[PDB]
Design a protein around this ligand. Structure first.
Ligand SMILES: *[C@@H]1O[C@H](CO)[C@@H](O[C@@H]2O[C@H](CO)[C@@H](O)[C@H](O)[C@H]2NC(C)=O)[C@H](O)[C@H]1NC(C)=O
Ligand SMILES: *[C@@H]1O[C@H](CO)[C@@H](O[C@@H]2O[C@H](CO)[C@@H](O)[C@H](O)[C@H]2NC(C)=O)[C@H](O)[C@H]1NC(C)=O
Ligand SMILES: *[C@@H]1O[C@H](CO)[C@@H](O[C@@H]2O[C@H](CO)[C@@H](O)[C@H](O)[C@H]2NC(C)=O)[C@H](O)[C@H]1NC(C)=O
Ligand SMILES: *[C@@H]1O[C@H](CO)[C@@H](O[C@@H]2O[C@H](CO)[C@@H](O)[C@H](O)[C@H]2NC(C)=O)[C@H](O)[C@H]1NC(C)=O
Ligand SMILES: *[C@@H]1O[C@H](CO)[C@@H](O[C@@H]2O[C@H](CO)[C@@H](O)[C@H](O)[C@H]2NC(C)=O)[C@H](O)[C@H]1NC(C)=O
Ligand SMILES: C[C@@H](N[C@H]1CCN(c2ccc(CC(=O)O)cc2)C1)c1cccc2ccccc12
Ligand SMILES: C[C@@H](N[C@H]1CCN(c2ccc(CC(=O)O)cc2)C1)c1cccc2ccccc12
Ligand SMILES: N[C@@H](Cc1c[nH]c2ccccc12)C(=O)O
Ligand SMILES: N[C@@H](Cc1c[nH]c2ccccc12)C(=O)O
Ligand SMILES: *[C@@H]1O[C@H](CO)[C@@H](O)[C@H](O)[C@H]1NC(C)=O
Ligand SMILES: *[C@@H]1O[C@H](CO)[C@@H](O)[C@H](O)[C@H]1NC(C)=O
Ligand SMILES: *[C@@H]1O[C@H](CO)[C@@H](O)[C@H](O)[C@H]1NC(C)=O
Ligand SMILES: *[C@@H]1O[C@H](CO)[C@@H](O)[C@H](O)[C@H]1NC(C)=O
Ligand SMILES: *[C@@H]1O[C@H](CO)[C@@H](O)[C@H](O)[C@H]1NC(C)=O
Ligand SMILES: [Ca+2]
Ligand SMILES: [Ca+2]
Ligand SMILES: [Ca+2]
Ligand SMILES: [Ca+2]
Lengths: 821, 804
């Protein structure tokens, strides 16, 4: 009773089966103008038939063993679901036919069989729908393929168990693979069912913690219409993201792949979930230029030893218990069995045709089917061997094996721990789950046959700690089926050393602009968020990748200018010392004795101090040299001017008594200098505001009226000396001294007046060189005006140094005779 | 047959119904050490019993009316689901017991046949019931299930609903958040088929409008202590104040109880429709946490005899309602004697106890139940009045009302269009849905008894054009129950003008810092992502809000410096004209023909030209003053130098010829200036790179070689005349003028060497000043020591003293 096409065999204990022998149903959703009929399954699935044969082979192998359930046989009733909720519910209503009559008091045939457990429901929505109806009657349901996390809820799904791991490790592993290859710009596609939606939600939650930006997220279906598919295609080809993560199955993904292949969209990196990473619907050679280089997940393979020889024994006339063998024979050989295609014989050979039935290389879901059947058999064997007094039920009492009920088998399945043929331990946890490792594979092209080869490139170990679970061998991956270069999948290129990041408005964090830093700031590492302002006495490059030290500007002792000015100063000091020496040697003579013999000594000492006071303007301006820069020249030159002015002419008649005048004339300068240095002294000053890349060192004078008073006092005494010596230029005594005094005063005023435009233009820039040159020029002019004339008669023409020449000049000059050479 | 507690009446045509009379089932763990019993239902639900009474009132009203299905009765079988999939699945297997026997080909043979089911409340229960009812094409009309996943007609073939689905609601929450200008919110969903698509649609709509979501959590009714503690810790670690909740009342009650136990105040709760009017959550003792909630409600309908029917209920007079006895026990808190808690009597008054049964303002879900029943009956009436030859079936054939089948009822339900008691039109679309408006409520506190009052503060109009659907009256909102101020729920504070948003690493784009703008760039808006560049002739102000105009710089008139230079030039022109006038006055005295008096006229005219040539430097250069700046002074000063050098000693004997030897040395310079002006003319220039804040206006010379030749010829002529006047400085003829020529050339060379460091140092306004001052000083010195001694001799010294 129930569906017609089935696999059935009698026994003492009956198991139920649910497998997708067809991929789907015929699209015939029309109005109800006639009474509705049964739908028609459309596309044959050879892999599902192999799964059904795995369950049949496991049952036969259990029934031949004397060590597992002796003297009682197992039977089966297996139906087709066609990947559809409605066919599975039609089969499940016949699974619970005995139990439902008792609950509804409906009463009658009294010869209907009871199933104790159900193996089946590949797809997760089909699994949830079957689990809802089976959990009413506490019938256990072991699934070989459904991996949704929503079926781990034991409040709603009381009797559901799995031989496959659930999909949360897979989503975490997908995030880990994206993190390993250093991408941050991806798109996601999931199937709109109970399988794709929670997996892609877990992947989104994991990708948010690892700073991965997701651009698009779309949903697809097997029964999607055309305009939805073109909306998804325009969403895909409007993005610059290359990596697409797909959580779907084969028949749910086929129309989108067909539309993408038709439009020739190339260069995408597909990350596949386990449900389509080995599908024969997607892995076609004609699709390769779109789907080459896919990276995907696989489960761990197992060995069922005599299974291939069992698969090679199928026949339509010999399989009396398998009602699916006839259509399998017709779809393999494209023929028709009697009772337009030609008539089948039974002589045809399975090895001649290439379908996924016997052309596989690893058993993964088939091993899960085998493990499910053996789990149920080991729970039954635990029932059979249990000793009175040590059971799992009330008082420690044992179930009866000849009247066994389904809830007792479910209770024994919750406490199961057995060893399989691989020598590993199979137990289920509190949520009914079962952990396992993952293999990581990559799609290649076969050079010989042209088909698609699945190459193992890594693994995911679930028993390691978080962060150390992934292994990938990068050298074995071909990236679009041909290339050895890891692709670029970021939103924007990396900012370089001279730049920083900038926000683009309305766009996520992974997309940024690269902005040049300003003239004062730098950056050194790659993806900077801000330019660091490096501290004082530093400035950036022209390229802003670092910053370098500023340049300190001042006049030092090692410049050529400094050596030249030092040589001129030392030569002046040597010449003045030479003149003092010849005055000391050739004394007691009328030329020296006529020049008062004591004012000349102090005049030469003043000239020595005025020459040596120009050395404070060269070097680094410190706090104390800036205090003695200006007063040193200010007192030395006024001492020299007073020594010149005291000796000239009848001004001494206006009132030794000569020295007191010099004493007052330099003591006034001494007191104004000491009150200036005690009220507000000058000090050094590091100027950075004039030019950006150069620190000047200059001197701030403090007060300004004190400096004006100093220069005014010196110019006042110079003008008084010039005026009083300007009257007396016609007296031809002492070798015409007053003419040279007026010449020296004129030289002083001309130099310090003509140096005015040089002083105001380059103010703040090395003006101390100008201040050295003016001092040296004035000192040289005064010394050469006063002493060299008398030196020429004293040294090179003696016996003219006589009293008769001082009182009456004999008209012979030094400079004309020296210029005559 | 089936479940024991039921409501049941007989009839010709039988409808089915599913309502939650209890809030859930007893939380017990099955160790499976004995055979499992049936689970027990707990926490009576008075609103659900009112919902069940709506269906019976509708069916009795239809049965008493002669204008709708005459001579034909309706019956019912109604069961309790307890918000659970398994109880509803037992009830649904009781519904389909006739149809399933024929499909399996599998005793009583008098089994009644259900032709339609009034649906469930929650979407998981509706999906599980619809999966089984679609196998037999039995129509199912739900009054409350609003999930989008039930709009898929490939999976759910026979499902209809009188409630709008949740996509408009999830768009409306994002519209509310956009209206109050928030960008930093959190979400909480219930882990079922109701909360997950609602929060997914909200997340997509909020990412469309630049709203950043901080956290996202799932809750349930059966969450334990550690999950609730984790969710409360996730809430308490976040600065987001606005929280959007998509859940029902039973699924949200444990989280709310734990938040109340910790006194977490200050959050802004945004309520979906399932818990926005829930008595489990809207309690006075929770008002310090969930006060001021803004939520959604459906539109209210009117059923004009329904309250009287609700008050006619009785445990011993309702013989078709099995749910009345437990209602009566739970209302009056007693025990009913069958056929401490006191013994109930039959004489109690329903108005004495405040339960949600007759304590309501508006009928919203009850009106949906009423519409579901009337939709089914109007489909049956459309069957009953079909005319032969115009049916909906094959060849235009009509179904038979005495032998009706459920697929024909579903076919007529897909083509239904009728008018209701409120005067609106009821049709279902191709996905089986029905749109409707929303009302927006705010949770206040009553000053009378302390209960929670729902106040209407706006609407959402789904018939309007997108972007114009929301209306909010803000003056009626009390935030947190007491405050009249809109709260702040942004991640970061705003950056003002003169600042730029800077990135914080590892954080979303709604969180940023503020960095000041650079010197040459400006930003006037707030929350500016970058500084904008000022234009070419503009610079930014002191806080970089707007560009101000760049200052221009040149030596100008009405400046004090330019006025002083102009007064000195006018004074020089005046005294040179005085000297010329005195010389033309005494043109017939011996001391004037002592020199060549025709040459001194040319010398004084060239001195006038040399004074007048200095006025071209002052003012703004206008691209023709730059052409006449340098050649005018060049030719005037070489005319002065040649006029001096002709009259010196022993050059005129070398060679009337004086004017020719003037003409050659001025014609050479005229040739140089005219070649320079014809080949590469000077041009004006606006210099901007010297200061980057001021624009200097200068003259680009155009050629340096020609300017070098122009200077060098003048220097050469000055050197030759200096040498030829230096050889004969001791001669006393012409009042010792050779030493004065020597002094004039010495002054010229001293000034033009003294002003050379002022050309390599300063660059702006102050260079034209020194070009005026050097010209003035050189020409003043030349004129002074050439024509002052003779002027003293003629004028101030007596003319009787040595004029012969
Ligand atoms: C993909 O991008 C294209 C290119 O911009 C979009 O096409 C344009 O869309 C705008 C928006 O209304 C229209 O004004 C233009 O007329 C469209 N141009 C063309 C050539 O169609 C397109 O809408 C985008 N699609 C998706 C799904 O985002
Ligand atoms: C693409 O973007 C990622 C994410 O920012 C970059 O990965 C960073 O690379 C730098 C340099 O190697 C590391 O210091 C960071 O730790 C990486 N971040 C993360 C989260 O792993 C990646 O370098 C970018 N790729 C390209 C080609 O620009
Ligand atoms: C919180 O952030 C939002 C941005 O998401 C701000 O809204 C902007 O406000 C400015 C000025 O008030 C408007 O010019 C923009 O058009 C608004 N943008 C949007 C998208 O609405 C909001 O002002 C911020 N709130 C506070 C208190 O700073
Ligand atoms: C919420 O914030 C608290 C406060 O930091 C976190 O508690 C600390 O977590 C760190 C890291 O796990 C521990 O080292 C500390 O001992 C914790 N306690 C304290 C008092 O600092 C808590 O982990 C956060 N929770 C969530 C869900 O974010
Ligand atoms: C949904 O709400 C809108 C606005 O609340 C209703 O439109 C109003 O209809 C009345 C009468 O038809 C008019 O007087 C108002 O001017 C309308 N307002 C606006 C803003 O258009 C609309 O009728 C409601 N729809 C339903 C089905 O009740
Ligand atoms: C070395 C100099 N110091 C600096 C300070 C400003 N400066 C300066 C330059 C030119 C003039 C025009 C003028 O009056 O001829 C006036 C001043 C030069 C100095 C120090 C002390 C006394 C001085 C006495 C007389 C001249 C120089 C003096
Ligand atoms: C008034 C003077 N003007 C000349 C003097 C120096 N000057 C100048 C201008 C620009 C640069 C290059 C730069 O800075 O880009 C260099 C020099 C401009 C003048 C005019 C004509 C003949 C003269 C004969 C003798 C002395 C002066 C003469
Ligand atoms: N995990 C899938 C089922 C599945 C696993 N592997 C497969 C291979 C082929 C087809 C389906 C599958 C689901 O729950 O829906
Ligand atoms: N829409 C809710 C059901 C619902 C609507 N309004 C309600 C009021 C109270 C309880 C439940 C509801 C769901 O699908 O789950
Ligand atoms: C299963 O059995 C093995 C040995 O019999 C034991 O080591 C292991 O812990 C058991 N597993 C569980 C989950 O009890
Ligand atoms: C999982 O993978 C790791 C690493 O390859 C391996 O050591 C471990 O044994 C595997 N686990 C199982 C159960 O096979
Ligand atoms: C900038 O220029 C310098 C030398 O000109 C060079 O060494 C440096 O690498 C450059 N920086 C960048 C980021 O190109
Ligand atoms: C329903 O009937 C009314 C009355 O004629 C009509 O205006 C309206 O368009 C109809 N609606 C549909 C969906 O046919
Ligand atoms: C700029 O800032 C100053 C003080 O910091 C203030 O006086 C002035 O008004 C500001 N200008 C603008 C345009 O805000
Ligand atoms: Ca056996
Ligand atoms: Ca955006
Ligand atoms: Ca009637
Ligand atoms: Ca983050």
């Amino acid at each position: 009773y129930g569906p017609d096409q089935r696999a059935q065999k009698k026994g003492d204990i009956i198991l139920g089966g649910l497998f997708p022998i067809h991929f789907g149903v015929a699209a015939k959703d029309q109005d109800l103008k006639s009474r509705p009929e049964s739908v028609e399954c459309i596309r044959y699935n050879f892999r599902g038939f192999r799964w059904l044969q795995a369950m049949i082979f496991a049952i036969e192998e259990i029934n031949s063993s004397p060590a597992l359930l002796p003297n009682l046989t197992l039977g089966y009733r297996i139906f087709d679901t066609c990947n559809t909720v409605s066919k599975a519910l039609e089969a499940t209503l016949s699974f619970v036919a005995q139990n439902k009559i008792d609950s509804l008091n409906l009463d009658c045939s009294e010869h209907i069989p009871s199933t104790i457990a159900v193996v089946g429901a590949t797809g997760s929505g089909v699994s949830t729908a079957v689990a809802n109806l089976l959990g009413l009657f506490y019938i256990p349901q072991v699934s070989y393929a459904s991996s949704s996390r929503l079926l781990s809820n034991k409040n709603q799904f009381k009797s559901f168990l799995r031989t496959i791991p659930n999909d949360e490790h897979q989503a975490t592993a997908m995030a880990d693979i994206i993190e390993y290859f250093r991408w941050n710009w991806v798109g996601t596609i999931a199937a709109d069912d109970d399988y794709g939606r929670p997996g892609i939600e877990k992947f989104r939650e994991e990708a948010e913690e690892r700073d991965i930006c997701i651009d698009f997220s779309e949903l697809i279906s097997q029964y999607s219409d055309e305009e939805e598919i073109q909306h998804v295609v325009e969403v895909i080809q409007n993005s610059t993201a290359k990596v697409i993560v797909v959580f779907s199955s084969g028949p749910d993904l086929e129309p989108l792949i067909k539309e993408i292949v038709r439009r020739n969209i190339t260069g995408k990196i597909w990350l596949a979930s386990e449900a389509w990473a080995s599908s024969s619907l997607i892995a076609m050679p004609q699709y390769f230029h779109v789907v080459g280089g896919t990276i995907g997940f696989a489960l761990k393979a197992g060995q069922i030893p005599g299974f291939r020889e069992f698969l090679k024994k199928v026949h339509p006339r010999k399989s009396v218990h398998n009602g699916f063998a006839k259509e399998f024979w017709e779809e393999t050989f494209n023929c028709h069995l009697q009772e337009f295609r030609p008539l089948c014989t039974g002589d045809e050979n399975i090895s001649s045709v290439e379908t996924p039935y016997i052309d596989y290389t690893h058993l993964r879901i088939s091993y899960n089917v085998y493990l499910a059947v053996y789990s149920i058999a080991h729970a039954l064997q635990d029932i059979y061997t249990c000793l009175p007094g040590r059971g799992l039920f009330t008082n420690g009492s044992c179930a009866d094996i000849k009247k066994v009920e389904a809830w007792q088998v479910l209770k024994h399945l919750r406490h199961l721990n057995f060893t399989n043929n691989m020598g590993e331990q199979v137990t289920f946890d509190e949520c009914g789950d079962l952990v396992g490792n993952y293999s990581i594979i990559n799609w290649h092209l076969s050079p010989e046959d042209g088909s698609i080869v699945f190459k193992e490139v890594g693994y995911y170990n679930v028993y390691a700690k978080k962060g150390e679970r992934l292994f990938i061998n990068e050298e074995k991956i071909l990236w679009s089926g041909f290339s050895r270069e890891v692709p670029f999948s970021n939103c924007s290129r990396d900012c370089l050393a001279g730049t920083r990041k900038g926000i683009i408005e309305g766009e996520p964090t992974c997309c940024f602009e690269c902005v040049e830093c300003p003239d004062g700031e730098y950056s050194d590492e790659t993806d900077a968020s801000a330019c660091n302002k490096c501290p004082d006495d530093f400035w950036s490059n022209e390229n802003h990748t670092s910053c370098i030290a500023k340049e300190i500007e001042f006049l030092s002792w090692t410049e050529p200018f400094g050596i030249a000015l030092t040589l001129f100063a030392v030569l002046g000091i040597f010449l003045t010392a030479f003149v003092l020496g010849v005055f000391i040697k050739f004394r007691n003579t009328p030329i020296v004795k006529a020049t008062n013999r004591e004012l000349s000594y102090l005049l030469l000492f003043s000239l020595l101090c005025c020459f040596s006071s120009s050395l404070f303007f060269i070097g680094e301006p410190q706090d104390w040299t800036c205090r003695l820069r200006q007063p040193a020249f200010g007192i030395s030159f006024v001492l020299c001017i007073s020594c010149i002015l005291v000796k000239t002419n009848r001004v001494l008649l206006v009132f030794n008594l000569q020295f007191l005048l010099v004493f007052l004339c330099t003591f006034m300068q001494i007191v104004i200098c000491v009150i200036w240095l005690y009220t507000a002294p000058p000090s050094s000053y590091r100027n950075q505001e004039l030019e950006d890349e150069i620190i000047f060192i200059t001197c701030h004078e403090g007060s300004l009226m004190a400096l004006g008073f100093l220069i005014g006092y010196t110019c006042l005494l110079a003008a008084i000396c010039f005026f009083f010596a300007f009257k007396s230029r016609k007296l031809p005594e002492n070798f015409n001294e007053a003419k040279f005094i007026t010449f020296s005063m004129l030289i002083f005023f001309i130099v310090w007046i003509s140096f005015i435009p040089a002083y105001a233009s380059t103010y703040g820039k090395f003006v101390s060189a100008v201040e050295v040159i003016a001092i040296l020029a004035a000192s040289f002019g005064l010394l050469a005006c006063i002493f060299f004339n008398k030196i020429y008669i004293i040294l090179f023409k003696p016996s003219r140094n006589t009293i008769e020449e001082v009182r009456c000049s004999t008209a012979a000059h030094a400079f004309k005779v020296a210029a005559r050479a």
